[PDB]
């Protein structure tokens, strides 16, 4: 659902950025 | 001192009355009130001292039927008592031009500013007993009948001649002219052909009272 | 023959009209032009009573100026303590279609009736603690439109038959049948001294009836339409009438004529109740457009508006101490104003 | 990638500002529907409850970002803090309550229409019970099965079978049954309206925001498919959806207009 | 008082033409719709024609449509009912009748033997 | 027709009511004004009393 899929996509994108 | 005792006693009496009134509210809300108003009352009652009361139920739904007897012909003051019935059940005989008098009574019922928001369930009664019209006087009192064909959307029951499928549908068209020309969204008119023998009219009363309540709720949600 | 009586009736009618015109030596609006205007009368909705299930059709204050009866087409009379909002009794009615209520000068008995053609006299002070119908006055041939107690023993009742009756409640029989109205006698008000009353009917006439003689004393004829409401001026020498013509009118019994017309051009709605403040100076009229308007009875000029009803004001009543105005409406609430 | 971040900044800006518009219009809507005694009826109670669930959804989303410490001075990899855990649980509770009360509206309307009698007093309190308690029960079950059994990494990037379907399941069910009951109400309206198709079209378009119907077109897709059109729709319009519902069901409700006008006078 | 007085010829040949007029007094004529009613010998009252406040909305009983023509003169509180081709069945007392309430669209005025707000009638005989 | 009895009651009523005496409207107005002026002090609607006797207390 909207919020949980935003948490998933956003925090994977921030994780990718961190590397 | 006695002021506290009096206040307590009064509040206990109030609590009893609150309990009774709250209990009766559900019974009042569940019971549909119906005004029965004749311009063939026996045919439309036997099959289902002042004001007269018939109390019955269909499918455990309480219906309360009120027939305004022993009141003089001047309806304008008492009929306003019935702005909060679910339907005005208008029984007109097919049958002075009693059709015209019935129709003007219905027009006055429809347009009256207090009786808006009350729907009409219109039982054209006696559609056998006089509307058989086998004569070798609808044509006389309503000369526009000569120009009216039986409608394409006619759905007859056999054993009624085309003379009857002309007559009854023309009368229905007259009442629906009165209905459609001066009412939208707030009150509805449900025509029903019916006969001295044709029973289960009570089922159609139930079905159209249900339709009225459904339309009320859809009206409140602003969906229609 | 009949045409001869028609002509004689018209001759007497023109006699009465000419006599009234000759005796209209002054006009009320001119006699009281210099009286100080009342300014503005902003009345507070000091209590709202929320008991009834359906549209309230009548209410009446007791002589104690504290308790009121209210009658609604849910078939409940409710007796309210206006000082506390507490319901003292609620009474089931055998017919839900009540149209009038009244509450005796003693407070012992409450009356109600409607399309049942019956006046029901309830005893509120019986020792058994229940409330039971003491009598059902049933000789009316049409709906009861108004009821007003003269004493615990006698009740005048008004009908949708063209007649009123003076009932003796113990006998159960109508001791006089005031007859001569030509339409429904919608409304009834007793004189402050209970030897006369005036009844207002759906023939644009109001008639003053002698309770002891039964004759019709005077016919007042100025209205254009059905008189829905009538109230004595607290002097006993004038009364006011409300009509579907969107006017109130003040009639004086001894002038035999209409002294004032209360109307405003933006009022198209009919009047449903009329009552006077204890001085008489304010005329309070209830209207179909869910408002009440307060009128200077001696100026024919507005003074205030009782707003905040959702639907037709059905009943209006001023306390005998003058302290508060009740206004019942088809919104099922009584609102008490002060 | 840097280019992606602009996409997510834009959508989370919408997610903030649109929910702000929603909460600001809707708090007014609630104060209207509760202050004005005429409007106290079961219908407006169900509406007011739904509106409260929209402020819960907005506020819990904001609290989720507030718990998501965003200075980037802490790496979100291997993260752990109590505030984040509770705020995610709250965001789930809020979304579950919103979806529950969209279904509560769907059920109240179909109960009113299907009822052969005018009363529905029991149905209202049953729908209040389900509308809040089932979100309570499901999100409490998710809190239990995480914190007491799988309290790993603040539950944030999960996509695994064990308990994500505890929340996903009710959402999917609720959107499905809303779609069915909405086509039911369309069926009833179509029979009611026998040249006037505009009224039917308007009623459909007015029901769509209230019954959560726009979720149906993505409700049954698998996650990680359709995101590029799912997320702009659900986030962008949903951020305004409380404001759309507040307009259509408080401000344009003619009873509310009349009551405000009488208060204005 | 509210007063209505009709006029119009007591006797006429079949196929003749006639005009009724009613003088209204004591009410704001422009506010009330006016009706004509008739009473044939030994029968109840029946509605003949009606006219709205302005004279816009007009209708007739079917045996009368086109044979009569209704009009109202708001300047002189006068109601008219024109008659053409009067048939034997039109032999009746004709009563002028006023709606009971101003500005309303409804009426309840055919009521036999009792009604205020309705005149004494003029005979027509064929 | 029995309507002669109704017209006879009407004419008898009008004959009775014609022979009531009538005062002039000026005296009626003086009566109403002299009543209102005397009792105007005793009208809680015209000149309201705060926090003394109201149903609010």
mmCIF file of N, CA, C and O in Angstrom, chain A, chain D residues 1 4-5 8 11 15 64 68 70 75 91-92 95 156-157 164 171 231 234:
data_model
loop_
_atom_site.group_PDB
_atom_site.id
_atom_site.type_symbol
_atom_site.label_atom_id
_atom_site.label_comp_id
_atom_site.label_asym_id
_atom_site.label_seq_id
_atom_site.Cartn_x
_atom_site.Cartn_y
_atom_site.Cartn_z
ATOM 1 N N UNK A 1 0.820 -1.206 0.000
ATOM 2 C CA UNK A 1 0.000 0.000 0.000
ATOM 3 C C UNK A 1 0.858 1.262 0.000
ATOM 4 O O UNK A 1 2.041 1.217 0.327
ATOM 5 N N UNK A 2 0.230 2.377 -0.384
ATOM 6 C CA UNK A 2 0.914 3.627 -0.709
ATOM 7 C C UNK A 2 2.048 3.995 0.243
ATOM 8 O O UNK A 2 3.194 4.191 -0.178
ATOM 9 N N UNK A 3 1.750 4.092 1.538
ATOM 10 C CA UNK A 3 2.778 4.514 2.483
ATOM 11 C C UNK A 3 3.868 3.464 2.634
ATOM 12 O O UNK A 3 5.054 3.803 2.686
ATOM 13 N N UNK A 4 3.494 2.188 2.738
ATOM 14 C CA UNK A 4 4.505 1.158 2.945
ATOM 15 C C UNK A 4 5.336 0.919 1.694
ATOM 16 O O UNK A 4 6.535 0.626 1.794
ATOM 17 N N UNK A 5 4.758 1.135 0.512
ATOM 18 C CA UNK A 5 5.564 1.040 -0.698
ATOM 19 C C UNK A 5 6.446 2.268 -0.862
ATOM 20 O O UNK A 5 7.551 2.170 -1.407
ATOM 21 N N UNK A 6 6.029 3.420 -0.334
ATOM 22 C CA UNK A 6 6.949 4.549 -0.313
ATOM 23 C C UNK A 6 8.079 4.345 0.679
ATOM 24 O O UNK A 6 9.226 4.674 0.379
ATOM 25 N N UNK A 7 7.792 3.796 1.854
ATOM 26 C CA UNK A 7 8.875 3.447 2.764
ATOM 27 C C UNK A 7 9.859 2.496 2.100
ATOM 28 O O UNK A 7 11.071 2.732 2.120
ATOM 29 N N UNK A 8 9.352 1.451 1.445
ATOM 30 C CA UNK A 8 10.236 0.487 0.798
ATOM 31 C C UNK A 8 11.094 1.150 -0.278
ATOM 32 O O UNK A 8 12.330 1.077 -0.233
ATOM 33 N N UNK A 9 10.461 1.831 -1.236
ATOM 34 C CA UNK A 9 11.211 2.395 -2.355
ATOM 35 C C UNK A 9 12.143 3.512 -1.903
ATOM 36 O O UNK A 9 13.308 3.562 -2.312
ATOM 37 N N UNK A 10 11.662 4.395 -1.029
ATOM 38 C CA UNK A 10 12.465 5.511 -0.549
ATOM 39 C C UNK A 10 13.667 5.028 0.255
ATOM 40 O O UNK A 10 14.784 5.518 0.062
ATOM 41 N N UNK A 11 13.458 4.113 1.206
ATOM 42 C CA UNK A 11 14.585 3.673 2.015
ATOM 43 C C UNK A 11 15.540 2.766 1.247
ATOM 44 O O UNK A 11 16.739 2.777 1.534
ATOM 45 N N UNK A 12 15.081 2.061 0.206
ATOM 46 C CA UNK A 12 16.059 1.400 -0.660
ATOM 47 C C UNK A 12 16.857 2.417 -1.468
ATOM 48 O O UNK A 12 18.050 2.220 -1.710
ATOM 49 N N UNK A 13 16.226 3.517 -1.881
ATOM 50 C CA UNK A 13 16.941 4.518 -2.663
ATOM 51 C C UNK A 13 17.961 5.245 -1.796
ATOM 52 O O UNK A 13 19.098 5.482 -2.216
ATOM 53 N N UNK A 14 17.584 5.586 -0.565
ATOM 54 C CA UNK A 14 18.552 6.175 0.354
ATOM 55 C C UNK A 14 19.656 5.180 0.687
ATOM 56 O O UNK A 14 20.820 5.573 0.835
ATOM 57 N N UNK A 15 19.321 3.892 0.824
ATOM 58 C CA UNK A 15 20.359 2.910 1.077
ATOM 59 C C UNK A 15 21.340 2.856 -0.077
ATOM 60 O O UNK A 15 22.555 2.804 0.127
ATOM 61 N N UNK A 16 20.821 2.870 -1.309
ATOM 62 C CA UNK A 16 21.691 2.851 -2.476
ATOM 63 C C UNK A 16 22.571 4.088 -2.482
ATOM 64 O O UNK A 16 23.759 4.015 -2.819
ATOM 65 N N UNK A 17 22.001 5.240 -2.112
ATOM 66 C CA UNK A 17 22.778 6.471 -2.125
ATOM 67 C C UNK A 17 23.897 6.397 -1.098
ATOM 68 O O UNK A 17 25.003 6.895 -1.335
ATOM 69 N N UNK A 18 23.618 5.789 0.059
ATOM 70 C CA UNK A 18 24.608 5.725 1.129
ATOM 71 C C UNK A 18 25.879 5.013 0.687
ATOM 72 O O UNK A 18 26.978 5.375 1.122
ATOM 73 N N UNK A 19 25.750 3.996 -0.161
ATOM 74 C CA UNK A 19 26.884 3.175 -0.568
ATOM 75 C C UNK A 19 27.895 3.973 -1.378
ATOM 76 O O UNK A 19 28.083 3.723 -2.568
ATOM 77 N N UNK D 1 20.231 6.712 -7.530
ATOM 78 C CA UNK D 1 20.770 7.698 -8.455
ATOM 79 C C UNK D 1 20.229 9.076 -8.101
ATOM 80 O O UNK D 1 19.147 9.199 -7.532
ATOM 81 N N UNK D 4 16.744 10.060 -9.488
ATOM 82 C CA UNK D 4 15.588 9.485 -8.810
ATOM 83 C C UNK D 4 15.162 10.363 -7.641
ATOM 84 O O UNK D 4 13.962 10.501 -7.347
ATOM 85 N N UNK D 5 16.143 10.897 -6.911
ATOM 86 C CA UNK D 5 15.833 11.643 -5.704
ATOM 87 C C UNK D 5 14.890 12.798 -5.999
ATOM 88 O O UNK D 5 14.095 13.169 -5.137
ATOM 89 N N UNK D 8 11.452 11.495 -5.908
ATOM 90 C CA UNK D 8 10.921 11.196 -4.582
ATOM 91 C C UNK D 8 10.746 12.446 -3.737
ATOM 92 O O UNK D 8 9.811 12.512 -2.938
ATOM 93 N N UNK D 11 7.374 13.813 -4.944
ATOM 94 C CA UNK D 11 6.207 13.099 -4.438
ATOM 95 C C UNK D 11 6.070 13.233 -2.926
ATOM 96 O O UNK D 11 4.947 13.291 -2.418
ATOM 97 N N UNK D 15 3.075 14.634 -0.770
ATOM 98 C CA UNK D 15 2.643 13.854 0.385
ATOM 99 C C UNK D 15 2.542 14.697 1.650
ATOM 100 O O UNK D 15 1.718 14.411 2.525
ATOM 101 N N UNK D 64 5.672 9.840 10.749
ATOM 102 C CA UNK D 64 6.613 8.862 10.225
ATOM 103 C C UNK D 64 7.835 9.548 9.642
ATOM 104 O O UNK D 64 8.969 9.124 9.889
ATOM 105 N N UNK D 68 11.599 9.518 11.029
ATOM 106 C CA UNK D 68 12.648 9.239 10.058
ATOM 107 C C UNK D 68 13.616 10.414 10.107
ATOM 108 O O UNK D 68 13.487 11.384 9.361
ATOM 109 N N UNK D 70 16.242 12.736 9.224
ATOM 110 C CA UNK D 70 16.495 12.926 7.804
ATOM 111 C C UNK D 70 17.702 13.811 7.540
ATOM 112 O O UNK D 70 17.933 14.202 6.391
ATOM 113 N N UNK D 75 23.007 6.764 9.177
ATOM 114 C CA UNK D 75 22.682 5.927 8.033
ATOM 115 C C UNK D 75 21.451 5.088 8.351
ATOM 116 O O UNK D 75 21.358 4.486 9.426
ATOM 117 N N UNK D 91 1.593 4.580 11.523
ATOM 118 C CA UNK D 91 1.233 4.819 10.128
ATOM 119 C C UNK D 91 0.386 3.686 9.568
ATOM 120 O O UNK D 91 -0.600 3.923 8.857
ATOM 121 N N UNK D 92 0.729 2.448 9.921
ATOM 122 C CA UNK D 92 -0.114 1.315 9.550
ATOM 123 C C UNK D 92 -1.491 1.390 10.199
ATOM 124 O O UNK D 92 -2.504 1.148 9.539
ATOM 125 N N UNK D 95 -3.526 4.061 8.328
ATOM 126 C CA UNK D 95 -3.997 3.657 7.009
ATOM 127 C C UNK D 95 -5.058 2.570 7.110
ATOM 128 O O UNK D 95 -6.029 2.560 6.340
ATOM 129 N N UNK D 156 11.126 -1.732 8.474
ATOM 130 C CA UNK D 156 10.947 -0.624 7.542
ATOM 131 C C UNK D 156 10.977 -1.063 6.081
ATOM 132 O O UNK D 156 10.132 -0.639 5.287
ATOM 133 N N UNK D 157 11.938 -1.906 5.710
ATOM 134 C CA UNK D 157 12.122 -2.330 4.330
ATOM 135 C C UNK D 157 11.577 -3.737 4.102
ATOM 136 O O UNK D 157 11.967 -4.412 3.144
ATOM 137 N N UNK D 164 3.646 -9.293 6.884
ATOM 138 C CA UNK D 164 3.203 -8.145 6.106
ATOM 139 C C UNK D 164 1.799 -8.360 5.557
ATOM 140 O O UNK D 164 1.024 -7.401 5.429
ATOM 141 N N UNK D 171 -6.507 -4.687 3.836
ATOM 142 C CA UNK D 171 -6.595 -3.618 2.840
ATOM 143 C C UNK D 171 -7.167 -4.155 1.533
ATOM 144 O O UNK D 171 -8.080 -3.563 0.939
ATOM 145 N N UNK D 231 2.144 4.908 -7.561
ATOM 146 C CA UNK D 231 2.579 5.822 -6.511
ATOM 147 C C UNK D 231 2.195 7.266 -6.799
ATOM 148 O O UNK D 231 1.688 7.943 -5.896
ATOM 149 N N UNK D 234 -1.780 7.196 -6.056
ATOM 150 C CA UNK D 234 -2.240 7.019 -4.690
ATOM 151 C C UNK D 234 -1.684 8.104 -3.782
ATOM 152 O O UNK D 234 -2.454 8.789 -3.109
#
